[PDB]
Amino acid sequence: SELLVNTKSGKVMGTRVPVLSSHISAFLGIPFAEPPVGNMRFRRPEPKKPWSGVWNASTYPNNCQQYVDEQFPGFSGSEMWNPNREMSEDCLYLNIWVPSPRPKSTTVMVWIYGGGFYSGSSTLDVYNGKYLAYTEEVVLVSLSYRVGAFGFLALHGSQEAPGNVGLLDQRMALQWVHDNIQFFGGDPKTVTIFGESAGGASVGMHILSPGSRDLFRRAILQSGSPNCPWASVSVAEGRRRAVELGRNLNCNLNSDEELIHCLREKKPQELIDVEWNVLPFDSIFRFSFVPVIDGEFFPTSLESMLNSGNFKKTQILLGVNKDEGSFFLLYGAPGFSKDSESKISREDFMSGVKLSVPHANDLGLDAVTLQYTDWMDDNNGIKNRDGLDDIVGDHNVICPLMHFVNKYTKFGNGTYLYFFNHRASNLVWPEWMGVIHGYEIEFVFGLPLVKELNYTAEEEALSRRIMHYWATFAKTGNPNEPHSQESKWPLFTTKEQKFIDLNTEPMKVHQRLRVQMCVFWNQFLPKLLNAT
Amino acid sequence: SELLVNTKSGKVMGTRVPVLSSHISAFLGIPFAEPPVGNMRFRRPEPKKPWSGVWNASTYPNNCQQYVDEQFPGFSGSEMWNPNREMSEDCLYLNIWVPSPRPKSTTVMVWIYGGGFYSGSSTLDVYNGKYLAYTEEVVLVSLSYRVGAFGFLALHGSQEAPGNVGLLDQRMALQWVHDNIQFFGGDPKTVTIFGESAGGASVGMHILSPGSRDLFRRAILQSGSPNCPWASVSVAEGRRRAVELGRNLNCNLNSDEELIHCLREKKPQELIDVEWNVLPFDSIFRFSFVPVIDGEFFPTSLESMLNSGNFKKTQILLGVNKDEGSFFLLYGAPGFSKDSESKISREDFMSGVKLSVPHANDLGLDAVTLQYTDWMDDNNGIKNRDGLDDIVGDHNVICPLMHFVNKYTKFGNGTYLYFFNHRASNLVWPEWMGVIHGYEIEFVFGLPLVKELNYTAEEEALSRRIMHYWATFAKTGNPNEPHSQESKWPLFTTKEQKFIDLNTEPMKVHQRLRVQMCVFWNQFLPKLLNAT
Numbered sequence A, B: 001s002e003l004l005v006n007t008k009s010g011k012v013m014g015t016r017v018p019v020l021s022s023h024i025s026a027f028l029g030i031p032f033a034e035p036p037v038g039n040m041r042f043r044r045p046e047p048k049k050p051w052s053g054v055w056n057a058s059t060y061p062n063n064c065q066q067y068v069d070e071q072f073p074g075f076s077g078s079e080m081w082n083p084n085r086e087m088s089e090d091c092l093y094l095n096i097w098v099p100s101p102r103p104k105s106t107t108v109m110v111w112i113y114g115g116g117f118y119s120g121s122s123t124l125d126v127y128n129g130k131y132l133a134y135t136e137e138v139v140l141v142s143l144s145y146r147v148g149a150f151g152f153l154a155l156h157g158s159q160e161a162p163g164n165v166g167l168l169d170q171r172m173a174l175q176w177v178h179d180n181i182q183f184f185g186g187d188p189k190t191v192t193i194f195g196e197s198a199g200g201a202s203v204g205m206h207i208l209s210p211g212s213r214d215l216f217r218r219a220i221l222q223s224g225s226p227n228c229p230w231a232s233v234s235v236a237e238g239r240r241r242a243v244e245l246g247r248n249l250n251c252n253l254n255s256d257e258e259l260i261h262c263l264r265e266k267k268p269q270e271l272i273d274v275e276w277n278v279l280p281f282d283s284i285f286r287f288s289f290v291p292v293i294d295g296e297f298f299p300t301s302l303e304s305m306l307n308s309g310n311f312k313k314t315q316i317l318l319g320v321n322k323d324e325g326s327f328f329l330l331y332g333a334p335g336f337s338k339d340s341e342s343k344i345s346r347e348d349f350m351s352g353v354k355l356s357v358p359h360a361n362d363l364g365l366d367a368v369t370l371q372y373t374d375w376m377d378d379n380n381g382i383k384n385r386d387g388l389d390d391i392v393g394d395h396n397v398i399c400p401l402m403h404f405v406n407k408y409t410k411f412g413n414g415t416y417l418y419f420f421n422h423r424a425s426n427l428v429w430p431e432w433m434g435v436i437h438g439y440e441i442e443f444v445f446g447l448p449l450v451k452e453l454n455y456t457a458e459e460e461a462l463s464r465r466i467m468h469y470w471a472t473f474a475k476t477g478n479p480n481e482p483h484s485q486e487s488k489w490p491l492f493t494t495k496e497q498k499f500i501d502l503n504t505e506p507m508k509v510h511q512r513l514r515v516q517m518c519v520f521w522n523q524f525l526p527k528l529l530n531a532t
């Protein structure tokens, strides 16, 4: 049949889901690794052993064990990113949408969720892939990987807890796509991985990792990049939090073997319930267990691999939102509220600044501070709040990404930069928060295109042509069509550094995104902190 | 007789000079100290021994031995600043302009010329006092003092050459006014010292120095401050420069007594011809022999005195011109030409900042560089040259002065702060230089009132109300005439820190003069340089 597909590990039976006026096929909850439980917690995935009979793949799988944001109970804006199914350690499954009728050898887009490496689900309504697969005639996969200590606890040296097993999870799913997408009419040669935030850092790290480079063709990165300050740790600091996690749970601490055996007997939510107590600073936009630079998944430092060009050469498409930081100030920084305008007394501004650059010394704090205040109007509660919003956005996403897009372009074969800044009309958060981190994703996944979600006609259009940009990029490596009258989105080149606005107005090209603050962030303050 | 006056040191006979279709009496080249010649070179002045007979005081006196600028031979724009009389170590003479008829007891303003403490004459055309004494009915005095090595060679411990003796020439002239001004109808209880650049710095340092506090009433400072980075040095630097001068002339360098011996046998121009070989770095806006923070004239460091309030509490009148640095880049930094727009390429721009901040470590260099660079336009010749202008303007005048005006206002009895930014219509220099360092002086001294000098009628008005500001402040301690119709120059207060624009247009009030750059130059960069 059409809804029956026979992979190299077993048969699976999908379901005919409707999407706008029509229907397509979906195969949800497909196993791709052996469940990682018991003795297998903190270890590299093992490929799912083959099954007999037909795997019922008609409902979403479980979500992985993860922290559950309860700051705003009932609030859709925060609830929409929480797990929506049961949470098991048995969670390494993927989902495929196939256009109906099944095409032969078509482009494949693998989605990779983010969530700071501490949270995120393959099964959220925002990652519902039926719209984009259908409208742009692509095969859409969305994978899953372990998060928090489950995915990234790291005792380098031990093979029982090496670290980066979450990235190894998503490489196994990619290797599953490589061997089975052809049985869904996916072309294993036209595979595009794409991810947001942690998921975008992840995309970046596969571009860098020699063990992952052959499992895909191209890459999209949204508001995330492999070199972000929150996105990695040294083995030493990785070890330290691993060890202190043992200390919170009154574990034996002499050797990794004893430590891990102690940590493997704890119920999963005992781990989640102390996961934040291992961070070295009072901070915003930092997460406890993240990828390690161990030397195996990452040959050397990310900077050196960028400099030597020791990475995958292909075309990348990538960009950032306008207000990356507003979400993280609302959760961790004083003076900000969901229900107020959040003007910020200057005293809170300093508290906010020291939170945003936890690692800086005093002199660097002053540099960050002088760099972002209007000294004709320092007690202006708005300019301070926008002040902080730009600090955490520029520090944690934008300037890290731009450093990556300049480094990569010296060696890549194509680069398209975007700047998404569309305040949705139906959005739930207050206006001060602007274009929220993560809220480009609705347009990528075509959610403006169903009329029951009450979007304006414009955001629909903008969603349809972002999907086309993404899809066309995934097919041809160029988001523009060759006929297509208007309006070509220019290559990003080392000398001219062009990019485009994603929003409801006619597209405009710009040069040097945030060059001024990014010189501060990528060259100067690094220099200040090294020498002081 | 009106032109014959009996002072405490002897009888003086003056001259009846015409002025603007009237006349007044001037007393020129009046001695106030013993000539500091032979064994008196480098030593503290001694009060002029009383003479017999009548001193023919109708001609200007000699100028001090000083460097002479030959960069543009014949060009009035620079020869305006060079000595216009013969030069001699016998140069310590003041000049008096008395209204006619003689006042009974009227205000006295004492001009203190600048010239980087290396140059300057009381007898320049632009310091002709007849116009302002005539127009605002004040007793105008114009003093002199040794400059460069003659005025500030500094070997602490040695009382044959202590340092600061150029400033002591000033104070001896100041006490001469104290004791004798009453005989010209001046009031020693209403004396206003005022000077420009090196002069303004000096005016500044008499309000610090205890031996000076009681020799005047008020203080006007123009484009100069005691705390200027070029305005002083330590004993250690002052001695090493004294010693390096001896090295440049084959002097005996074992003791000071032999050192100073050797130096007083050298002919004055032999000191001038090597003067500059002694600076520590290839720089701009720095000068060889300047005041020393010795512990006698200056009891402690300038900052401690500013913080502790250890200075004289009075009313000050001070301010700056719009483009203090343009003159100094024309003479010292690559790519500036007098006959060009001096569009600055970027490689010359950073030669510029290095020359501009000679004491900066490299980390300080990038700090300065990124704060004056439009990184969407780094090869914009204009903005680079405009940029470099601001750097040396802000670093050497603007921001030091604002530091002083805020430090002082915490303790004085009235601050009035100005921003001169009128480009004189008949200016000989090219327009890229703007409101050049030193060219408010023509308006202070009323030259636009001379018709043959071809100033615009609007320039005449600005000169007239500038001298009134100056003169009205010199008597009342306040620029304005109370309960009069003209718009009113507001006090500078610690909280609102207001100031006004001097120019042909109706008066504007502004707030915080160049705070953002000044926060950099006054709080952050100094902090950056302490650390390693």
Ligand SMILES: ONCc1nc(CCCCNc2c3c(nc4ccc(Cl)cc24)CCCC3)ccc1O
Pocket: A069, A071, A276, A277, A331, A332, A333
């Ligand atoms: O901001 N400080 C705290 C803070 N408490 C809460 C309260 C609810 C769960 C607490 N869980 C967390 C803890 C800490 N940091 C966290 C950062 C982001 C997030 Cl979502 C949870 C964190 C550091 C160590 C203590 C726990 C919510 C947000 C929040 O930020």
Ligand SMILES: ONCc1nc(CCCCNc2c3c(nc4ccc(Cl)cc24)CCCC3)ccc1O
Pocket: B276, B277, B283, B284, B331, B332, B333
């Ligand atoms: O920077 N302007 C002018 C400038 N002229 C020259 C030569 C022309 C006049 C000589 N006298 C000078 C010397 C030195 N530095 C000076 C700085 C400012 C002034 Cl006025 C005169 C200076 C450095 C050591 C050598 C002599 C050389 C370098 C230079 O920079």
Ligand SMILES: *[C@@H]1O[C@H](CO)[C@@H](O)[C@H](O)[C@H]1NC(C)=O
Pocket: A056, A058, A059
């Ligand atoms: C597949 O699983 C769904 C989920 O409960 C169930 O409703 C459906 O009947 C199952 N189909 C078969 C053929 O087992």
Ligand SMILES: *[C@@H]1O[C@H](CO)[C@@H](O)[C@H](O)[C@H]1NC(C)=O
Pocket: A412, A413, A414, A415
């Ligand atoms: C990509 O590579 C091909 C062949 O290696 C080359 O001709 C083309 O110019 C490259 N394009 C870019 C944008 O790097």
Ligand SMILES: *[C@@H]1O[C@H](CO)[C@@H](O)[C@H](O)[C@H]1NC(C)=O
Pocket: B056, B058, B059
């Ligand atoms: C003073 O000097 C001037 C300048 O030469 C001269 O004209 C005048 O007659 C002199 N007066 C006396 C009394 O010597």
Ligand SMILES: *[C@@H]1O[C@H](CO)[C@@H](O)[C@H](O)[C@H]1NC(C)=O
Pocket: B412, B413, B414, B415
């Ligand atoms: C100056 O001092 C007097 C008393 O000494 C005081 O009444 C007055 O307010 C002060 N003026 C200023 C401008 O500080």
Ligand SMILES: [Cl-]
Pocket: B431, B432, B433, B434
């Ligand atoms: Cl200009």
